[PDB]
């Protein structure tokens, strides 16, 4: 993906599980989930953003 | 062709036996060619039986038929001999025993339909009961397609023979030999 | 695009001129939703059996099975004469012919035109510019035929007689 | 005492029926209305602020619309709007 | 957990075809199409006819009757065979 793109998260326990969000950076280095991304929804601990890997994101 | 104006279907095969291109109405396309063909070779057969049955009755009667059954009858003659099996007479249960030989051997010819609709060896109509061997012997004559002819005029001729003694009280020996 | 029977409505995608009684006639878009072809069967089978019943009403009134000829030309009145066993009779030639339309369906559904169970034993249609207009009849028969049916049955509870005997007497009107 | 016959038939169709289907109408006008503000209010500059100080006018606009609600939502059904499909709704892992 | 024990003689039965294996009809895995067709329609008739001669049911029944009329349902699932066999070529 690339930054600013809106992605449907497919990691199966996200609280945004089969939402969508907005990426906001992604690393370069060796990190295990380097993409970082954005939601409207709070989750229920009221965080709004997380972190995630490439096979648990798809751009729509 | 039989009727130019109305065509013989397609389906139709010309080789099969006793093909006059007689299908104006197409009937032939609706339903299987080889059932179509078994169907009819058993109804000549069984009308054949009927119509001459109907002849015979009238000039001959077996020994002792003549109590059991009126002078003359013909379908008649059924109802008679089933209501003294009903009663419970012994002697007339002429229509049971015919009625049992002719599930019997539906019975057990049974597979043969049903084989030759899967392309089986025997061709339709073809039991191969001929112990004479002198009609089908050998190359054989028309006779293949006078058993389709004579079978079709049995069938028109059962329909008539029935039809008759319906509105009237006559036989068919007594129907042709004195018309009103 | 418009659709040709309403002006100022847009015409549905799905349909199309191609389809024999086409006229751009989807003001709710039941063909956006669900196949076109399955839609076109529907109204063909619709059109069939209303086409069957709409002429059942009238042709007792004309002449009566010799066997029937006791039972009533009304037809609502002939639904419950008939023997429940008559009726069975009726079901099973029914469902008989209905196991070439389920064959047809489900099996080999995408091939093949709507409507078309191959029943075409006088072999007309064969040259495809006279199917076109056989067709198209088919269609707008069945149509007229569905509305007609629905009014000869809503008019017969009404007035309790054949359609040929209510105009006899015109009773038409409520009263 | 007066008992009421709820079975279908035209004869009583005024105890159960037609109440019935002048509730169905109020009670689908005020679901169309209902979710014509909250897809509304989605496309706002505060979607959550428009749910606790409710844009009058707007809600007005849409309390009006809501007498033809068995042709519009149905309309929406076959135009498919009224319905998501399965893979845009979040669901628990199982 | 186990291995789950099966009777000997048990075979794979899940089919995703358009009719299922002839394994499915057991001792009537050989039998034909036809013969399953015409066995439907000759234990429906009859069937039907036993069941009939019975439906005012008497102190002193037909045995013959009360165990033809069992053609009845057993005609069901010889039309099904049927249809099996005829989708396998059989
Ligand atoms: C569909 C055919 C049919 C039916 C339902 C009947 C039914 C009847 N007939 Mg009639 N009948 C028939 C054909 C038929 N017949 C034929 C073909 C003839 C000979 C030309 C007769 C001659 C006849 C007489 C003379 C009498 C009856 C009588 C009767 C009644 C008592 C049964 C009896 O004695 O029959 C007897 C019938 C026969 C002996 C004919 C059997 C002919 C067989 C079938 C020829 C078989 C040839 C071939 C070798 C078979 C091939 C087998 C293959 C299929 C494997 C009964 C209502 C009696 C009655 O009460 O009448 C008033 C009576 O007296 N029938
Ligand atoms: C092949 C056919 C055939 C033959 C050879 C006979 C032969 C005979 N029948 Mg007949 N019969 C036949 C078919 C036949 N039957 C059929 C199909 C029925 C009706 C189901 C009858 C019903 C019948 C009755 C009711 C009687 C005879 C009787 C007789 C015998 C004495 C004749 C008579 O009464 O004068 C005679 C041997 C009589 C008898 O049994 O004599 C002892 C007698 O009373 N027959
Ligand atoms: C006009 C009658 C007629 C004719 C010409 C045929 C002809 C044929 N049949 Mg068919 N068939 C008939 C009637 C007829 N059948 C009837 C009524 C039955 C039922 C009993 C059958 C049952 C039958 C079977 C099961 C099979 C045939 C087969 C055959 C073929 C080969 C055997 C042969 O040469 O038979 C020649 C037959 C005749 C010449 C019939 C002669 C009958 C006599 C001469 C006249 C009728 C007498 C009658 C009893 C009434 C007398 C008069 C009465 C009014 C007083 C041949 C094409 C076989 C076949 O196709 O495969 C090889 C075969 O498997 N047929
Ligand atoms: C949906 C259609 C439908 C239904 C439910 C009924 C139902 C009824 N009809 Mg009506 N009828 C119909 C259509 C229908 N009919 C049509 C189209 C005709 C004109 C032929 C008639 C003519 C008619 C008469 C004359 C009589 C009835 C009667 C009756 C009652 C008893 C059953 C009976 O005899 O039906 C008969 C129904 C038919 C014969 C229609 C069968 C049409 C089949 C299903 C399709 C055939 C298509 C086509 C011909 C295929 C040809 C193939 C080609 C190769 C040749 C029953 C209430 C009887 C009654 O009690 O009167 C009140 C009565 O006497 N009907
Ligand atoms: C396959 C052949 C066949 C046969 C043998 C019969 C035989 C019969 N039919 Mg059926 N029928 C058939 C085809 C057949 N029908 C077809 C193709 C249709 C049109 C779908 C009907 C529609 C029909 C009706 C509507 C009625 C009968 C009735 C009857 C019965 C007459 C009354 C009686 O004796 O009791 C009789 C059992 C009558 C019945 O059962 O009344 C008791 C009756 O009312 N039949
Ligand atoms: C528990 C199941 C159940 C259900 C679902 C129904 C459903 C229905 N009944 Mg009721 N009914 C039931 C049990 C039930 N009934 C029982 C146990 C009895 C006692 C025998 C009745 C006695 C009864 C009578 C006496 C009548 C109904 C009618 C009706 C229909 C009228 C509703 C309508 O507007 O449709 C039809 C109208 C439209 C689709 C459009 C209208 C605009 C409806 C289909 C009426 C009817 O019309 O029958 C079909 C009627 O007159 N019912
Ligand atoms: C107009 C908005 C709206 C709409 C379209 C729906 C639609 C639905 N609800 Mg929801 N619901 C809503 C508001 C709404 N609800 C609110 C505010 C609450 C909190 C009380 C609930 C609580 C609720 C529960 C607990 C359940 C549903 C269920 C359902 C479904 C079946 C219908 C039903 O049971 O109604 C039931 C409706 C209620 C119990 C409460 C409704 C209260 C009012 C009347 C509606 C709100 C009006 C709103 C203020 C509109 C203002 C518009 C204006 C600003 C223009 C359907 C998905 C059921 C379901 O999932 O079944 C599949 C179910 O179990 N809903
Ligand atoms: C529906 C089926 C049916 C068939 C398949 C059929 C075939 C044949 C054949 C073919 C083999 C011949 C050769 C033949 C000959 C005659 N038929 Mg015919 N016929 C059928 C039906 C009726 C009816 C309903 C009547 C009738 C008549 C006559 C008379 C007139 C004699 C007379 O005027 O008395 C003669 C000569 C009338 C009659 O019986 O008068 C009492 C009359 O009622 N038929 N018929
Ligand atoms: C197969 C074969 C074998 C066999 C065999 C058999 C049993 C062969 C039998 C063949 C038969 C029985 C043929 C009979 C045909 C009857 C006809 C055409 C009647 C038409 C009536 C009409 C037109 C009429 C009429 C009218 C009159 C008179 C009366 C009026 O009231 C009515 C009406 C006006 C309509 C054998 C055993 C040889 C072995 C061989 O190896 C294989
Ligand atoms: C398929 C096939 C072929 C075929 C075939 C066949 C048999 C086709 C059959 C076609 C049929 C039966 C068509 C019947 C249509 C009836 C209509 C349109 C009635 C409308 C009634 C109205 C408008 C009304 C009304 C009423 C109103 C509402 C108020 C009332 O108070 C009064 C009133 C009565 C006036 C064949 C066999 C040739 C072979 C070929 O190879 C293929
Ligand atoms: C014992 C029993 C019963 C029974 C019974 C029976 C035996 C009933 C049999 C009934 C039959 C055979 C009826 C058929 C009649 C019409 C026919 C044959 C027309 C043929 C010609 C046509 C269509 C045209 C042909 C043609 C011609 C003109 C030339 C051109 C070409 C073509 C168009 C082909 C009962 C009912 C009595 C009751 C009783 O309790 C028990």
């Given amino acids: 993906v690339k930054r600013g793109s809106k992605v449907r998260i497919l990691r199966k326990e996200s609280y945004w599980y089969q939402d969508i969000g907005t990426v906001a950076t992604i690393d370069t280095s060796g990190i295990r989930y380097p993409v970082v991304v954005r939601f409207e929804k709070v989750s229920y601990s009221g965080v709004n953003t997380n972190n995630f890997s490439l096979d648990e994101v798809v751009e729509v | 062709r039989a009727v130019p104006f109305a065509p013989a279907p397609d389906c139709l095969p010309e080789n099969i036996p006793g093909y006059m291109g007689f299908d104006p109405l197409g009937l032939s396309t609706l339903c299987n060619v080889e059932w179509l063909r078994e169907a009819e070779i058993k109804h000549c057969r069984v009308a054949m039986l009927a119509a001459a049955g109907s002849i015979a009755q009238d000039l001959y009667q077996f020994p002792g038929v003549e109590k059991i059954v009126g002078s003359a009858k013909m379908t008649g003659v059924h109802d008679k001999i089933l209501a003294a099996a009903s009663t419970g007479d012994y002697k007339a249960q002429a229509m049971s025993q015919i009625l049992f030989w002719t599930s019997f051997l539906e019975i057990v010819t049974l597979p043969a339909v049903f084989e030759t609709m899967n392309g089986g060896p025997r061709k339709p109509g073809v039991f191969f009961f001929d112990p004479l061997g002198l009609g089908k012997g050998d190359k054989m004559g028309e006779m293949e397609l006078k058993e389709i002819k004579n079978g079709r005029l049995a069938m028109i001729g059962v329909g008539g023979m029935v039809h008759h003694y319906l509105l009237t009280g006559k036989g068919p020996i007594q129907f042709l030999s004195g018309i009103p | 695009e418009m659709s040709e029977a309403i002006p100022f409505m847009p015409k549905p995608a799905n349909i199309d001129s191609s389809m024999p009684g086409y006229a751009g006639f989807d003001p709710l878009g039941f063909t956006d939703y669900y196949s076109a072809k399955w839609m076109q069967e529907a109204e063909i089978k619709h059109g069939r059996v209303c086409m069957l019943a709409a002429l059942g009403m009238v042709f007792p009134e004309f002449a009566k099975f010799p066997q029937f000829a006791s039972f009533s030309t009304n037809p609502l009145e002939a639904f419950y004469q008939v023997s429940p066993a008559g009726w069975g009779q009726i079901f099973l030639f029914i469902g008989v012919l209905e196991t070439f339309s389920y064959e047809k369906s489900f099996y080999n559904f995408e091939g093949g035109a709507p409507g078309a169970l191959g029943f075409d034993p006088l072999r007309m249609s064969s040259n495809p510019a006279s199917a076109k207009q056989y067709a198209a009849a088919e269609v707008r028969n069945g149509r007229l035929a569905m509305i007609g049916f629905s009014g000869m049955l809503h008019h017969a509870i009404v007035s309790k007689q054949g359609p040929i005997t209510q105009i006899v007497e015109q009773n038409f009107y409520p009263k | ?94 | 957990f186990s291995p789950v024990p099966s009777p000997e003689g048990t075979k794979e039965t899940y089919w995703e075809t358009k009719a299922p294996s002839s394994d499915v009809l057991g001792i009537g895995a050989g039998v034909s199409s036809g013969n399953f067709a015409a066995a439907s329609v000759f234990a429906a008739l009859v069937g039907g006819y036993c069941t009939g001669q019975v439906i005012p049911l008497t102190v002193e029944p037909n045995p013959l009757f009360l165990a033809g009329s069992f053609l009845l349902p057993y005609s069901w699932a010889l039309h099904v065979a049927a249809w099996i066999q005829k989708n396998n070529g059989k």
């Fill in chain 4, 1 to 94: 005492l007066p008992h009421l016959i709820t079975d279908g038939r035209w004869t009583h169709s005024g105890e159960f029926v037609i109440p019935g289907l002048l509730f169905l109408y109020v009670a689908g006008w005020i679901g169309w209305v209902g979710r014509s503000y909250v897809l509304f209010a989605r496309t706002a500059d505060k979607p959550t602020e428009k749910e606790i100080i409710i844009d009058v006018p707007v809600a007005l606009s849409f309390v009006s619309t809501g007498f033809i609600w068995p042709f519009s939502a149905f309309k929406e059904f076959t135009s498919g709007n009224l319905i998501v499909p399965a893979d845009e709704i979040t669901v628990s892992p199982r």
